[PDB]
Structure formats: C-alpha cells, structure tokens
From a paper:
During the assembly and purification of a novel two-component protein nanoparticle with designed octahedral symmetry (to be detailed in an upcoming publication), we discovered that a significant portion of the purified sample consisted of a smaller, unidentified protein complex, which also exhibited octahedral symmetry, as revealed by ns-EM. To identify the unknown nanoparticle in the absence of a corresponding amino acid sequence or prior structural information, we turned to the automated model-building software ModelAngelo. Similarly, AlphaFold 3 (AF3) predictions using the catalytic domain of the A0A140NDX4 UniProt sequence also showed high agreement with our Cryo-EM map (UniProt, (n.d.), Abramson et al., 2024).
DLST is an octahedral subunit of the E2 component of the ɑ-ketoglutarate dehydrogenase complex (KGDHC), which plays a pivotal role in the tricarboxylic acid (TCA) cycle, converting ɑ-ketoglutarate to succinyl-Coenzyme A and reducing nicotinamide adenine dinucleotide. Notably, DLST has previously been observed as a contaminant protein in samples purified from [name] expression systems (Bolanos-Garcia and Davies, 1760 (2006), Andi et al., 2019).
Numbering used by the authors:
A (entry chain V), B (entry chain H), C (entry chain A): 172 to 404
D (entry chain D): 347 to 404
Write the structure that this text describes.
Amino acid sequence: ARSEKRVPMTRLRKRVAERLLEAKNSTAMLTTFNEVNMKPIMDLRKQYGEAFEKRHGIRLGFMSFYVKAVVEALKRYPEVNASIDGDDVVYHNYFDVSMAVSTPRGLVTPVLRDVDTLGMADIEKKIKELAVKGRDGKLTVEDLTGGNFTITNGGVFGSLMSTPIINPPQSAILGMHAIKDRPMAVNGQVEILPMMYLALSYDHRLIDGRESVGFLVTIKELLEDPTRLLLDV
Amino acid sequence: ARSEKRVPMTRLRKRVAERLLEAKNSTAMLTTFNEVNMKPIMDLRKQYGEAFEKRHGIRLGFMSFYVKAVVEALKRYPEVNASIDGDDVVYHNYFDVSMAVSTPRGLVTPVLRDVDTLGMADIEKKIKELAVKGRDGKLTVEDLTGGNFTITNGGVFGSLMSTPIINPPQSAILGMHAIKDRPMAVNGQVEILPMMYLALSYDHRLIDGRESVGFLVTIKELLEDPTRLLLDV
Amino acid sequence: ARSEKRVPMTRLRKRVAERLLEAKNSTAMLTTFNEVNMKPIMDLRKQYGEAFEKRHGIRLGFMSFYVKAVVEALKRYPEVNASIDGDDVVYHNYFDVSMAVSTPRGLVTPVLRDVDTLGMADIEKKIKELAVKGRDGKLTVEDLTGGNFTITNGGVFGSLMSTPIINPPQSAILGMHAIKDRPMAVNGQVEILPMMYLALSYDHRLIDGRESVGFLVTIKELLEDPTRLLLDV
Amino acid sequence: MHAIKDRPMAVNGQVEILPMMYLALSYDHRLIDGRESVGFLVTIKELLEDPTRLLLDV
C-alpha cells in the first residue's frame, strides 16, 4: 500500500533541471505586475475578423497584437533588449522574440525572427507554422536558437497571475494570463470589463525599477488602444 | 541611546536558518496565484453546523474541506505528489499532507497521514489533536516526520496574499489567506462575495506551468462546489 | 543590420551587480502583500494643506505619513528592526529609515536618521534636502551609510504591484505603489476608492510569517486612520 | 478635400448629427475606369473613419 515508485531521470531531463537551477542562482530575478483592459482588441476581432480572414487567409488572433506591442516597447527601452556577456552589456539592435508553444511533452519556445518588419498577417502565419511543428514534435534546434525576449501565455490553462522565469542569456520575460471579467472603475462608474494581468520578470542587475515599470506601462497602453502604434504616442 | 543589543543564535536557531537558505538555493521555486469564492462552504457550515456537531462531537470547520480538495488534486496531478531524490523522481502513491499549526514559538508542520481514507469528521478530530499538542509544545519528532505536501494558512493573521516557501524534500506548498469581501462579476452583475486568494509555490525543475495551474484550478473548482467531490467532475 | 553593440561594464557597475547577486543568494527573501485605502490621508492634505504650508514653510506630502507609520510598526515588531551578523541577531533599539530618491542615474537610498523624534514638518524638510542633493548628484557616502529599514516608492512610475529586493545588511523592505481607483466593498455597498497595494519583502530566516503579516497589517491600519498614532491603538 | 460641416446622418436606424466632409476625385478616364475610381475613393473613406485599419491592413 504505502509504497513508492522510482523513475530515473533521463540525461536530457537532468540537463534541463540543472540549467534551470543555474539560471535561477545566476540572476537577480524580480517581478513587476500590471493589468490591461482587453475589450478594445476583442471589438477589433469582432468587427474585422471575417474581412481579415478573407483578405489574408488566416484569422486575426490576440498573439499578433502582443508581438507588435512588445516590439514597440523594446524600442523605447533598449535596456530590456540586451543581455550580459561576462563583463560586457550587449545591445542587440534587432528584434527577435521567443514565444512559447505547447508540444505533447510540455511548452517549448521557438523564435520569431526579425519581427519588426513583419505585418500582422505575417506574424499570425509565422506563429501557425511554429505551432504545427511544435505539436508535431518537428522543431529543429535552429528554430529554438534563442532570441532576445520571451512571451509566455498561461491563459490557455486558466491562470490568474504567476511569476514567470527568465530564459538565459535573455534578461526579461513577459507572462500573459487568463482574461476574466472584473468590475472596474471608469470615470466614477462601476463597469464590468474583460481584464488580464501582466507579469514581467527581469534581471535586476541589468534592468532597474524605472525601466521595468515603464516597459510594462507601455505594453498596457498599446494594447488598450492599438491606434497609438500608428501615432507613436 | 544609539546602542545595539546582540543575542547569539542557538545551535537550533542557526540550523533552521541554514536549512531554509539551502532549500532556497537548491530549488527553482515559482509561484502561481488564483482566487476562490468561499460563500458555498460558509452556507454549508451555517446549515449543517449544529447537526454535524451533534452527530460527530466536533464542529465542522474549513480545514476539512481544504484537505479533501487537496487529496483529489493530488490524484489528478501525480507530479505534484512527488519529489526528487538524486537522479530519481519518486512517485509516492499515497497521501500524507503536512499542515501548519501555531506553537507558542512559531508555526510548525505536523503530518496528517493517510488522509485519503479518512472522513471529514475524522480529519477535524485529527487536526484538533495536533493543534492541542502543538500549543502544548508536546509534538514528537515522529509527528513532524514530513509528508508529501504542505498546507499553510495565513488567514488567522489577516494576510491578503503572499509567497509561501517549499519545505524539502517536498516539491510544492499551498498557501491559504484571509477571507475578505470583494465585489465580483457574476453573470453580468456586480455582487459582493467573500473571496480568498490561493498561492501555490512549486519546484519548477519538477513541475511545469501546465500542472501548477491545473492543480490550482482543480482546488478552486472543488471548493466552490463540494458536490463535485461526489460526482468526480 | 543584425549587428550587436557591446559596452564594457565599469568597475562600479560590476560591483553593484555582484553585490545584488550575492545579496539575492545569501538571504531567503519572501514577499507578503496587502492593500490600503488612501482617501483618509488625501482628505487631510486637502483640508490642512494651506495651513500646514503657511505655518511650517513646506507642503504636507504623503511621505511624512509613511515614515510615521513605519516607525510605529518597528516599535511593535522589533524583529523587523534587526539584522543578522554572523552568529548573532542584532537588535538596534533605534530608528533609522532608508528612503529611495531618484538621481539622474537611477534610484539611490539615503538615510533618515533618528526619525522617531522628528515631527511631520521636520521629516518633510529632511526629505526635501535629500531629494535636492540626490537630483544634484551631491550625496556623500555618509548620507548613504545604511540604516535599519528601507522604503521604496514605485508609484511615481505608475506601478501596480511588484516584488522589492532587500538591501543588506537590512532584513526587510517596504514597497509603495501607484494609487488607483478601484471598486471596494464597504458595509455591503460598492464604493470606488483610491487604493494602493503594499509589498513587504523580508528575510525569512529571521522574520516569520506572523511578524511579516502583523507588520504590514499595522501599517495598513495607521494609514487608514492616522488618529490611531495619537491613541496608540 | 472640403469643409467639415455638421449634418444629420442615419446610424443603425437612429438620426445622429455628425461632422461630415465630402470627397471629390477627378481622374483621367482614358486610363482609370469607374471600378478603380470608386474603389480608390471607398478605400480612403474607410481608412479615415477607422485609422486602426491602417495597422490591420483590412
């Protein structure tokens, strides 16, 4: 009855475990949090969903909006788009974003490369290719060769809020969560809105509290009014 | 005036401090969070409190509901009911749950053993015995010989939300908090409900984001409708 | 196009990075959270702002209220006003509070010394001197010689909630955040209030969950009714 | 482009006063056909009434 069952870890399983622990102890990870109102994007999908699919051949999703917001944030705060290499701080000056996809054996993070020049239709198509290969277990090491910044999305599982973990040599990670209806204060009235928490884990020995808050405030602002991506405000 | 006072730490005090720090640095601890509506259980206590006491000789409390929810969650996600021993992942296949009780000199965690076969009346009686011995400082090392999972409750102190710390060799811990009235969105209306935050700290090198969120979603669901423990839904 | 830019870290920049990482790995940092209703203080500023300025020559701000609340909390929970020195726990028996100010090159934390004997007007004047020297980059090492407890304020940047980092040899830190309107449950009604989250990061190998929650509950209570500082309740 | 002037308009079965502007497109018919001229002017109308469509490319 009261008997255990032991399974030796594979050399792959142990190496992943060791790398995670070394990353944990080699970085001074801290986490900041915020909330974003998602109704403005849900309205856009509801209004232009069919026209977008008819013109481009792929559905308009939420992911394409997150990538554009992150790219603009990485332009305004370069220190988030950087990493430490020994004694040197390396500024990349280009925009590769890792994104987590679910394989049959857990989440893996392929890279969207040169995302600053893609359109929204291109991003959605590129994400679909990575998603299908990930589900098929067909991603190569080249696709997983890391970028500068990571987006992970725990909303599919129904998470409210959590602390994401950085993926070295990257210095920061953005965690998306479930969208849930909550009462909110709007111009002195109480209104129920679809709200989502944002979590940013960052390496404090490179990024300061000013930059982390400003980076996450920028993402909040661009998601609540995508027109600001056009105005650059 | 500006003078310090120094107290050498006892060898017991230092050993506890050292063990905590080693645990902190030997595990990749992360925390996920969620919220649970507690009114359904408060109604059950209000309706069946006297009948339960008259039949069983002990009052119906909240703790007996948390233990049953945790046991069902540990069945659905075995990876939370496991620990790492060197190169091996050990699956226990039995259900021992540690629970924190307040001694005169801080919290201590005796073990509820084989909680899957006990009824709610038995759990409440077993918790009362541990509580009285803990207050009396009369627990033996056998009672503190650890289990597989820990429940800690900071609600008595009035905490809103916090990050609990794992107790090795265990891999996860559940933190309960204070129950506080908050406005909530229910079917498009705003309703004030007694709400509690849940916090789960887990060792990421063993448990993944899917399992941690699913584990905490399961507990939320079972506490908001205990009848689901009967249906197994 | 896809070309990096490398900047060697100055010996000052590396030393700060190393000290932060050593602090991270040498302490068992945990964080508790709470929320405070700020309207009672905003009313006091609105009512007595002009009279206070006319009598004392300086404006009544929020910072003077936070310092008084912290000092009273440090009296009720001495274990927060302490640090570990090798094998000894050192109780300071005096009240020096570090406070973060923004320089042109990031936040720095000068010390308010013997804050228990100052009045609110004195605290505001002392904070203004440190603020001007910090903006001028004119603080000496004597001003930065650390105290017993730190207050950091991320509200100016617009942060909702975050995890602050301890500054050794200190054992705890208090993080203030942005004040934001939220609907709240008050005597069965829904009322929009200006609310702020509080975050306390503490060294668990010295401070226990009881003390951390009690310390943060005390601050919440004193800020929601400053008259309790007079009654000592 | 012309002056912006308030006019009553039909919006989802209601009458609402809106700031409206007329657009005029003069085109060389021996190169451009009626399809292109109308489509060109319809596109401008759509992008001005919701600039977010410049981001979506719809």
